[PDB]
Amino acid sequence: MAVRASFENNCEIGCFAKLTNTYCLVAIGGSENFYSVFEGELSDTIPVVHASIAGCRIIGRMCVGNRHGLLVPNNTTDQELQHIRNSLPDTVQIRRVEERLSALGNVTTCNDYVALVHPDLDRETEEILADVLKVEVFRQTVADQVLVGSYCVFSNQGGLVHPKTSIEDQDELSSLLQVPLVAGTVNRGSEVIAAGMVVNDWCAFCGLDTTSTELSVVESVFKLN
């Protein structure tokens, strides 16, 4: 169910967490009020790891994962790689890709079965996705927007998308992922959906400024409570 949250008075909770059905990465600079909401509302089984990447807290935008695997970007230290490894369940395998577009959460989004990807991914990293996230990579992005990862959040039950998506791109998208995509917003008018929200299959965290009306659509599209 949509819990609102904030990391250090910032509503962009998509920047500071990564939820997958199996693990939950959460950023390091925070302080209980945020970590709790995760640990609390999370389904006990799914561990919650305090992580960073390259030292930074925006780990949700620097990291792409599903239940099978996490890809961390080239700037990831090995003190970090190790600590993500020594905290996740050893189903999930971690590969530190080496892609020019380090922002792996901005530039690719994946559920447990598909990934939209940004036109300019290296073929190398297309393979390291579909070999680690056991997924079907599909270089497709909406009209214009190439940062799929950030403008379109999707689970295995539904998905949101930038409010300014066409009914036709919606259409096609909802093919590839074979999930019902609704155009929407979060944090009271924000297009950058992914920046604002983190979704599982059983939980959703949105920012403290998400209007009730939005909170609803989230619940609905994600087929939650």
């Binding site: 390091i28 600079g29 302080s31 030292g55 003190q79």
Partner: protein, 402 residues
Amino acid sequence: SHRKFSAPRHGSLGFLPRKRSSRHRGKVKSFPKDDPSKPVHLTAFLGYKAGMTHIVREVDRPGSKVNKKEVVEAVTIVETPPMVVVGIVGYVETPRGLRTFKTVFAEHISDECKRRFYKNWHKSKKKAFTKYCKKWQDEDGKKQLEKDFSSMKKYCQVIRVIAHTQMRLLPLRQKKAHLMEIQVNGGTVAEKLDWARERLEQQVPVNQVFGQDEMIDVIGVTKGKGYKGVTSRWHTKKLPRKTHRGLRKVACIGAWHPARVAFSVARAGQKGYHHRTEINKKIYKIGQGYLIKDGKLIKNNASTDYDLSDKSINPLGGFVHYGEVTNDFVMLKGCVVGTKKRVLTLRKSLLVQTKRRALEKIDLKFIDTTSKFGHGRFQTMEEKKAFMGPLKKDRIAKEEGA
């Protein structure tokens, strides 16, 4: 009329006699306040500025951006061979201040220590303390010495020990040792006299005075810069290019009245070679020095718990303008006043260290030992020879070496 725009003053008036220091050593001027509840301990030490390098360590500062992260921090190496105690001074409190009550010197004063008493050691007859040391043997002199100790016990309030460094263990040209009064704190006057009297003629290593990851004060004389103008001495604004008689000057050195030049106006003169006291310098490491049990041990100087490389604190090709460091050393964090091989005074902190910057455990991961005589790129000799392989001079040597 008032100056049109406000601007803060250039330089501090708290260091006004901007003159060459009357001393080269750097005197303490304030010892830590003595409390008898503490155990008896020494409060200061003498070291020599060997050089600088940088280290890699992990930070344990919660709530910080660099929490659990690696940082690179510059450090200063201060070579600290053990001090030798040769005397005891007693002071008595008077309504005119502390005054020296009685001084007792040990027998067998070291030869390098005795050099301090002579302006021309080469022509001297080396007669200093020769008649004094005779009173440590006869009963008449020994009775007088015991009265001097008893008088110190019943009349003196603070006692100090005279300690000197050991020039023969340093790569310097100077053979004249540095004498220093180091205050003994932490006990009754009787206890600190008994403690000091046992240490006569003995060696006090630096690890008995200071400890790991504690913050001390460094006292010394800065690098001399000679006669300097106002732009370099007081960092005043340079005048425009169109100025006739010179632009590295202060344009107005005072109003018409008070009809004099004030002491607060920036003026040219000596820069550098000033006595300074910097507080809150953390001890990152106290090096262990060279040993010989079966072979020479150097690993205990630069190897960490994560490096495990048999290397000493000395850079590749040696410390520039200093020499080789073979004794105990203190790795202080940051910069320290003075040139290379400048004698420095290390003093216990006068403050109570309670902030989280203090009382923080320091655990080194890496110590840089690249050559500082250029853009060095190799930590050790063996790493360099492994990288480059055999060279032409190695071939012609091995040709002669069969």
